[PDB]
Design an enzyme around this catalytic site. Structure first.
Site, mmCIF file in Angstrom:
data_model
loop_
_atom_site.group_PDB
_atom_site.id
_atom_site.type_symbol
_atom_site.label_atom_id
_atom_site.label_comp_id
_atom_site.label_asym_id
_atom_site.label_seq_id
_atom_site.Cartn_x
_atom_site.Cartn_y
_atom_site.Cartn_z
ATOM 1 N N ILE A 62 9.136 -3.618 8.633
ATOM 2 C CA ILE A 62 8.877 -3.216 7.271
ATOM 3 C C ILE A 62 8.288 -1.801 7.337
ATOM 4 O O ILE A 62 7.196 -1.594 7.847
ATOM 5 C CB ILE A 62 7.958 -4.229 6.594
ATOM 6 C CG1 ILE A 62 8.682 -5.601 6.580
ATOM 7 C CG2 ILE A 62 7.547 -3.742 5.173
ATOM 8 C CD1 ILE A 62 7.832 -6.748 6.068
ATOM 9 N N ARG A 85 -6.717 -1.988 8.078
ATOM 10 C CA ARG A 85 -6.979 -1.876 6.642
ATOM 11 C C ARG A 85 -7.743 -3.032 6.028
ATOM 12 O O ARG A 85 -8.073 -2.988 4.849
ATOM 13 C CB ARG A 85 -5.688 -1.619 5.850
ATOM 14 C CG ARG A 85 -5.263 -0.160 5.924
ATOM 15 C CD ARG A 85 -3.772 -0.017 5.699
ATOM 16 N NE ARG A 85 -3.291 1.358 5.887
ATOM 17 C CZ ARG A 85 -3.368 2.340 4.983
ATOM 18 N NH1 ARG A 85 -3.924 2.113 3.797
ATOM 19 N NH2 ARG A 85 -2.877 3.550 5.275
ATOM 20 N N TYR A 144 -12.273 -6.502 2.382
ATOM 21 C CA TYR A 144 -13.448 -6.167 1.629
ATOM 22 C C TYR A 144 -14.346 -7.402 1.506
ATOM 23 O O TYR A 144 -15.463 -7.391 1.993
ATOM 24 C CB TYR A 144 -13.055 -5.600 0.264
ATOM 25 C CG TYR A 144 -14.246 -5.228 -0.561
ATOM 26 C CD1 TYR A 144 -15.395 -4.725 0.040
ATOM 27 C CD2 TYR A 144 -14.247 -5.398 -1.936
ATOM 28 C CE1 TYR A 144 -16.510 -4.406 -0.712
ATOM 29 C CE2 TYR A 144 -15.381 -5.069 -2.712
ATOM 30 C CZ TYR A 144 -16.496 -4.578 -2.081
ATOM 31 O OH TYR A 144 -17.594 -4.233 -2.823
ATOM 32 N N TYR A 170 1.076 -10.977 5.788
ATOM 33 C CA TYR A 170 0.909 -9.570 6.135
ATOM 34 C C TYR A 170 -0.436 -9.375 6.819
ATOM 35 O O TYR A 170 -1.509 -9.615 6.224
ATOM 36 C CB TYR A 170 1.065 -8.673 4.896
ATOM 37 C CG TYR A 170 0.956 -7.190 5.182
ATOM 38 C CD1 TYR A 170 1.041 -6.701 6.491
ATOM 39 C CD2 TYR A 170 0.780 -6.266 4.137
ATOM 40 C CE1 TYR A 170 0.949 -5.328 6.752
ATOM 41 C CE2 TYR A 170 0.658 -4.902 4.382
ATOM 42 C CZ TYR A 170 0.755 -4.445 5.693
ATOM 43 O OH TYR A 170 0.671 -3.103 5.935
ATOM 44 N N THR A 187 0.824 -1.251 0.000
ATOM 45 C CA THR A 187 0.000 0.000 0.000
ATOM 46 C C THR A 187 0.831 1.262 0.000
ATOM 47 O O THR A 187 0.351 2.332 -0.371
ATOM 48 C CB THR A 187 -1.006 0.135 1.194
ATOM 49 O OG1 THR A 187 -0.407 -0.325 2.410
ATOM 50 C CG2 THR A 187 -2.238 -0.699 0.928
ATOM 51 N N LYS A 192 4.555 -9.868 8.750
ATOM 52 C CA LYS A 192 4.521 -8.450 8.989
ATOM 53 C C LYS A 192 3.261 -8.215 9.810
ATOM 54 O O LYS A 192 2.142 -8.451 9.354
ATOM 55 C CB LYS A 192 4.466 -7.651 7.685
ATOM 56 C CG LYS A 192 4.543 -6.152 7.903
ATOM 57 C CD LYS A 192 4.144 -5.348 6.662
ATOM 58 C CE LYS A 192 3.986 -3.890 7.010
ATOM 59 N NZ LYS A 192 3.742 -3.016 5.823
#
Lengths: 291, 292
Positions: free
Chosen positions: A205, A139, A108, A134, A45, A162
């Site tokens: 990261i 998000r 989503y 991740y 992102t 991450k």
């Protein structure tokens, strides 16, 4: 072992008039390597991947790979909320030379924990290349539960997480459940690093390492050696609070552009900071540098 | 002046051996129309748009439009976290004959309120069809602030909001700022309709109306005629509780397949319910129908 330890850069995408600027990406990546980045994490992102075309992602990845030229690991963000598409982007990244891929959880659509396992394992089996999981609930609105991490960490290709959870109870529950010799934990949040390092994480990261890679990696090296970085970190914390002013990568790009990496541009639906806020942030950065 | 009022269906995608079953799409759409569905919303999350190929999305929307044949609006879910992409899908939707588009806020990237306006308006200006904004913070982690909703309602083509905040202070703040005569407020949460209808919403865009369209629309028609639906809702509430077993559309497809609209399949990363849970859920539907 581990792909890397310390600071990986969640690399930004340089735009000129809404075009990807290859000469600037090359210049940025070289600047990162010369200033001790331990890995380049590509098309996440921070790179605005949700608005990159497949072609831009491909152009960017290949450029990074070929420039980096085996100097540090190149990790390609390839997972999206579509498992087939994730397999395909992953396969293509492998063919281009990626050292690893990074797979966000679905979002989503989301999925359940059992569905996560299916998804992550389908992609890892298909690609047989080191996989960095991740997890970023702010998000995706979903999480990889600690027991889901142990299950996944048992896959031979799935070697790292991450964690932008920013939840220290969750990190402790994860450590109790994996073997850090073979499964690495990287903070996904620049401003929790002092505690993340102190709790046995393998690195970070990083957004801010896009512009202060040398001092961010040097912060890691200090504590790895046995030193206290709680106070040392403050001036960086001050810069990070300034970066808080809007959703990443809206603020960081004010600084990458300021250093001459692309113009200050963001692709819709993102928008650049307005003039006042841009100037303040740049000033806060200049202030960090003098010191 | 509204596209529709009452119950729109967030249409589910019928898979048979991992392929869109067109005849089942057709049978299902006729089922909905015949049971008074007031609109059909195509290619949303409930339809698993995130895993559909561009080809599938288009065969699905062309089937629905041509079958519906202008009987009720066909509203194409077209928005994504990607403005440019969102524009092109919307132009393609219009060209196949859609009546309106639905545009969720961005997600994963998210954006701020100022960018939200630029995103929705760039699509609105480029497509020139009625737009339904869609706000669902439990999947996007952001919101369209009441004052942002206000601004967007000025836009010539932005005519409605599917509101899944499930937050009634929010609803009242939005009502205070817009005119519901020309900007429709549709609930996006099946289980709050009783309160959503008493506070002047124009209807619902519904998951459960995939299988009980007749009942769910009749519940709206009832309160609209001045009857209390609070108690009348309970059996429906019981079925919805059973539907919360997992993440939409994982449960609802256990019931659409049950009625013969495709098999009980979901495309990865989603998975179908364990079939024990599939059984409980179907019997609970059956129990709802038997109560009738």
């Amino acid at each position: 072992t581990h792909l890397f330890e310390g600071v990986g850069v969640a690399l930004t995408t340089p735009f000129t008039n809404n075009k990807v600027n290859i000469e600037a990406l090359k210049t940025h990546v070289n600047f990162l390597l010369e200033n001790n980045a331990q890995a380049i994490i590509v098309n996440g992102t921070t790179a605005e991947s949700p608005t990159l075309t497949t072609d831009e992602k491909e152009r960017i990845l290949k450029t990074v790979i070929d420039l980096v030229d085996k100097r540090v690991p190149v990790i390609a963000g390839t997972g999206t909320n579509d498992t087939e598409k994730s397999i395909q982007a992953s396969i293509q990244a492998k063919a281009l030379g990626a050292d690893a891929i990074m797979l966000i959880t679905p979002y989503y659509n989301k999925t359940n924990q059992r569905g996560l396992v299916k998804h992550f394992e389908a992609i890892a089996d298909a690609v047989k290349l080191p996989v960095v999981l991740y997890n970023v609930p702010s998000r995706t609105n979903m999480t990889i539960e600690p027991e889901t991490v142990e299950i996944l960490s048992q896959h031979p290709y799935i070697v790292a997480l991450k964690d932008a959870t920013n939840d220290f109870e969750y990190l402790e529950e994860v450590k109790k459940r994996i073997d850090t010799n073979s499964f690495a934990l990287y903070s996904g949040n620049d401003d929790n690093v002092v505690e993340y390092y102190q709790r046995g994480g393998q690195g970070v990261i990083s957004v801010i390492a896009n512009v202060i890679p040398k001092e961010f990696q040097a912060l890691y090296d200090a504590q790895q050696s046995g030193l206290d970085i709680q106070d040392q970190f403050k001036p960086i914390g001050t810069l990070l609070s300034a970066l808080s002013v809007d959703i990443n990568p809206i603020p960081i790009k004010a600084l990458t552009s300021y250093l001459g990496f692309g113009n200050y541009e963001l692709r819709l639906p993102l928008v650049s900071l307005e003039d006042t806020d841009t100037k303040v942030l740049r000033e806060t950065y200049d202030t960090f540098k003098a010191g």
